Design a protein around this ligand. Structure first.
Ligand SMILES: [Zn+2]
Ligand SMILES: [Zn+2]
Lengths: 660, 660
């Protein structure tokens, strides 16, 4: 899987003329070279529904006079650039106008994404209709006729559809359209039927041609949906609707599954379709680095001007990131993540949470923020993952012990694992009893919110002893055999009519309300929804409480310590074949501009970044900066090594060579 | 005016007992010393309406047994700490329950801030009622009986009120309550009558006792409202509702007026009343530094626990900022700002704008962001300011040439000033004709939005030649005697039903649409609302266009150039008495946590920050880091000096000593 990809959008209105008139093999090749691009996904069929080749199963764009798809594959292949081919599935707008009977409908007869033809935008087809047969024919034609390096199928996933075809079919199969569960399950079958028919059609022509089905998100805990692809493309524009948490939450779930996967961002300031929109180079330098460090290849979105001329400014911008990716690839191929901590996301565990961004939940964003800022080495796991390689399992806020979860947690604890649990985590489904041996009994929903946490151990809060406000829902708890690491204090009263103090919550009554943080032999419990609190209010104390509990659980076994500050990111990747570890160190700080877009313009050097590793190896040979190939001083005793990076700009890889 | 103030909130419910029971002279003094506090505003009367002294004109808090106000003034005065005294005016909640007839009403009979007594919160009194007489009595009592260092009067400003008293009075004075203008003007008289009665009552007891009337914002272009105070306190919690633009927009307007003024932030993570809420020290280190650099003293908000014990964690946190302010004060007293650029805010010019934060407009935030990120030395000016000392006047987006503005702009241009204007700036009120000699004629509202700007000069856009998307409303214009610095390109069409291309706007038609940026002898015009665009979308090209035009207008006369990166702030302040300039250099990067709060945890050193100054002095004696008192190498030729700061952490002052 190539590291330096471009996703070249070509959603082009029938009402624009002279399509491709300014295309040239020379221009296409010069700009790929300016961008250091080694793969470019080009269009066979766009959202408007047109083919960019003289098609027999679809209509060519009515203002295109030549085989643009063919010319692009030839131009790229002649300079060693691979060319996966894009087909819009969910959208075919020129067919939408002829076959509205095949479009998705909600319960109230509404189309998506746009609810009429009297407004601009696209109308999604239902794959439970004969539109599926037309899609297979069109996919078959492209796979037969063109020497592409794979197929990208867009606007697909499990839907809920109430179109005439779906309502008749559900009634004939004895399903109830008024039962939401029935319609969700119908849509699971409809989607699986589509991906099964695509794999069979393609395997009858070019066996093992790569296929990716784009839903815009990799749904966690769904191995069936991931397995319908040959590889994963994580569409994740941090300035385009996804936010900056979405990529690490996805990548740290993807890498341990064994799938090859890329992070796809955009060249655009905002989102897809932003003609004339440009990030600063430093944004793409950091975003590509963060893909490499997490075990991913890179894609950068672009849209080709209707005239077919590739934009110089764009490939200048892509090249500033991709020249650096070229020099580092060698240290990223076949890499496996070393992690101390398994995070079972609320999403992976199949439990309801508050949305905090388009495809991320608030508990999950809370936890990932603390893990990244805390330099904890982690993977994200689901109920199918093997937990036994992880020292600590995090159960954030809402992991109730249902039939599908408790046995796997009990087995992890029996085998010597430790758990960090917060809030409802560990409760039975009924929320009446704590089922994990964490050293306390549950006395029910805490009856004050907000309330206070007082640390009872030194080195937890940077400012020391105080009553710190907790905004999360709490559990009142009673110590049994556990050790108290901090306590709950009640406010004088809850903010209410006739009883309120100042602008917000009442101050602390300074009356003890039982323990707030409890340590036992098998881990640490925090009596508040602290992870959702950190994604909502962002109080620093929430992170300090969690990172204190994790550092205590990991003790002397912690694999990494560093002075890399909070906004920085680190990973420790293993190239076994090459008998080396790669410590990835990054520092960039997105900053809010416009109303809410978080952007990167500055890239500030750090100096004298100290790392202490604890590798499961016998003898450390040497330590060097890649790709500079600059030895640095280190001190090693067995697999325990310490070093200092003189200077870090954006991203620095530090290679530790060993003897096993 | 002291540099190290605390605003000690004490809004305390009647339903909390043992008020002040844990107060002690020793605790109050220890915590002031831990915090390096040299002034603390303490409460005589809170929002709940209680006195904190045995009052004859108001009721003491019913659970307070001793003169808390008296004890606090004595404890502070005995260690050389000044004590201004706080009186809630707008709120007296225990009186609200007895005299609801004196409360403000809107057109629909609604109270503010909270629209019933069956919900928690405060109910604002109307100062057009006999409540004003009770306020004067209570202010008189506090000024007679207590040795305070000033009065802070809270919840006041110009209102619009439709209470029974106001409606009767308006009808009797021949005003029309259904005419909004009439009610606004009534409220201007009501507020002026309140501040006039306060100054006369206080001057009859302690002539020239400091008074500040808090509206939460200094309204720009209103010298009458500023002049009702002895000094200005800019309430500006960047994590508490105000945002990070509000302080520089206010401070760079305040300093050149001659008022002594402070920046008031909070110790809290969020806003006032956040018991148990704590920022990281680095946030207050930066925020206090930014006050010093802009010519302001510092206040940090706190709220005293009802028990009267000052919180150790809080005064640890305040001390980490205030120890550093103590060492730097010497270089901030009697300082005057050196600026190349006058920014006439939309607010100062009295013109409508889109709100972009609680008390800042989008055009004004756009402009301040570009000036700070661009290291342009600036003041904010109104129609009463003297413009003649400024090389460049900025007219952002919407400064139409009404009777109150055009003569002052024509006089500034005649005297050799240059203007940067955008969008509607310079148009007549009718928006049919450009009234400034900027080298083009106006051909009306541009009929495409969005559209494109192509730079025609090198060194404008970091990625070079391209069509960059402009989202702001445009003016189509026609070159006459001006020079074109870039052009407008039309899209194929506007996004509409039946005509749309891809997800957003149509790509560039590459058809010239007239000039977009025009240079003349007297300045530069940009044919888009670029400042509102930068506060909405945040496209980097918008800043690059503006800073290119400003650098061109200033040419060789630019007073400062630096490698301090974009997120950094610089000012050049003049201590005339001490025959030195102070170059202030800051780097901190607030980062979004929770849902939207922008916080500071990291403080990253910068290295080898280069500055070139052009001072109007003959001979530079020396250059040193204060307060370290460390000489640095420099090269001077007349008033032209260059130096390099080895290391900058948070804030560094660089002192340039001269001979005139
Ligand atoms: Zn359907
Ligand atoms: Zn009134």
């Amino acid at each position: 899987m190539r590291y330096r990809q471009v996703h070249l959008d070509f959603h082009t209105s029938e009402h624009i003329s002279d399509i491709g008139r300014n295309f040239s093999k020379k221009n296409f090749q010069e700009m790929l070279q300016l961008g250091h691009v080694n793969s470019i996904t080009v269009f066979a069929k766009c959202h408007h529904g047109w083919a960019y080749f003289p098609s027999a199963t679809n209509e060519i764009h009515p203002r295109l006079d030549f085989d643009l798809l063919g010319a692009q594959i030839e131009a790229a292949h002649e300079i060693g650039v691979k060319v996966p081919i894009y087909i819009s599935v969910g959208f075919d707008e020129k067919l939408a106008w002829e076959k509205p009977q095949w479009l998705m409908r909600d319960e109230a007869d509404r189309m998506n994404w746009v609810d009429s033809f009297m407004k601009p935008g696209y109308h999604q087809f239902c794959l439970n209709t004969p539109y599926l047969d037309l899609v297979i024919e069109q996919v078959q034609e492209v796979v037969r006729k063109y020497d592409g390096d794979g197929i990208f199928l867009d606007i697909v996933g499990e839907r809920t559809c109430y179109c005439t075809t779906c309502l008749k079919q559900m009634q004939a199969d004895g399903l109830d359209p008024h039962n939401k569960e029935d319609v969700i399950a119908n849509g699971r079958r409809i989607y699986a039927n589509y991906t099964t028919r695509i794999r069979e059609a393609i395997d009858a022509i070019k066996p093992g041609l790569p296929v990716f089905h784009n839903a815009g998100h990799i749904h966690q805990g769904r191995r069936d949906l991931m397995g319908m692809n040959s590889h994963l493309e994580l569409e994740s524009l941090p300035t385009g609707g996804w936010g900056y948490d979405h990529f690490p939450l996805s990548a740290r779930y993807a890498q341990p599954t064994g799938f090859h996967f890329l992070g796809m961002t955009g060249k655009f300031h905002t989102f897809w379709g932003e003609f004339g929109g440009y990030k600063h180079p430093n944004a793409l330098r950091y975003e590509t680095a963060l893909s490499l460090a997490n075990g991913a290849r890179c894609s950068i979105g672009d849209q080709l001007h209707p005239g077919g001329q590739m934009d110089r400014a764009t490939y200048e911008l892509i090249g500033k990131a991709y020249a650096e990716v070229e020099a580092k690839e060698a240290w990223c191929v076949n890499a496996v993540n070393l992690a101390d901590v398994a995070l079972l996301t609320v999403e992976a565990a199949g439990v309801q949470q508050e949305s905090g961004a388009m495809y991320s939940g608030k508990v999950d964003m809370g936890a990932v923020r603390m893990l990244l800022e805390g330099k904890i080495l982690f993977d994200i796991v689901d109920l199918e993952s093997d937990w036994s390689g992880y020292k600590v399992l995090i159960l954030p806020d809402s992991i109730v012990m249902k039939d599908t979860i408790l046995p796997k947690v009990e087995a992890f604890l029996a085998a010597g694992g430790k758990v960090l649990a917060s809030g409802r985590s560990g409760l039975n489904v009924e929320l009446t009893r704590q089922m994990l041996p964490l050293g306390f009994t549950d006395s029910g929903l805490n009856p004050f919110r907000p309330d206070y946490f007082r640390p009872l151990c030194d080195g937890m809060a940077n400012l020391g002893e105080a009553a710190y406000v907790m905004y999360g829902d709490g559990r009142r708890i009673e110590l049994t055999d556990g050790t108290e690491l901090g306590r709950r204090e009640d406010p004088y009263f809850n903010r209410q009519a006739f009883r309120f103090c100042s602008h917000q919550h009442a101050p602390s009554s300074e009356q003890e309300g039982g323990p707030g943080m409890v340590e036992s032999a098998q881990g640490i419990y925090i009596a508040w929804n602290v992870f959702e609190d950190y994604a909502t209010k962002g109080s620093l104390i929430l992170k300090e409480m969690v990172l204190f509990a994790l550092r205590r659980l990991l003790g002397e076994q912690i694999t990494l310590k560093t002075t890399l500050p909070a906004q920085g990111v680190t990973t420790l990747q293993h190239q076994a074949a090459e008998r080396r570890y790669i410590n990835h160190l990054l520092y960039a700080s997105p900053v809010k501009r416009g109303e809410r877009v978080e952007i990167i313009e500055d890239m500030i050097p750090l100096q004298q970044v100290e790392v202490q590793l604890q590798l499961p190896v016998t003898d450390v040979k040497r330590v060097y900066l890649a790709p500079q190939m600059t030895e640095i001083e280190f001190k090693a005793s067995g697999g325990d090594v310490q070093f200092t990076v003189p200077q870090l700009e954006c991203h620095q890889m530090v290679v530790v060579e060993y003897n096993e």
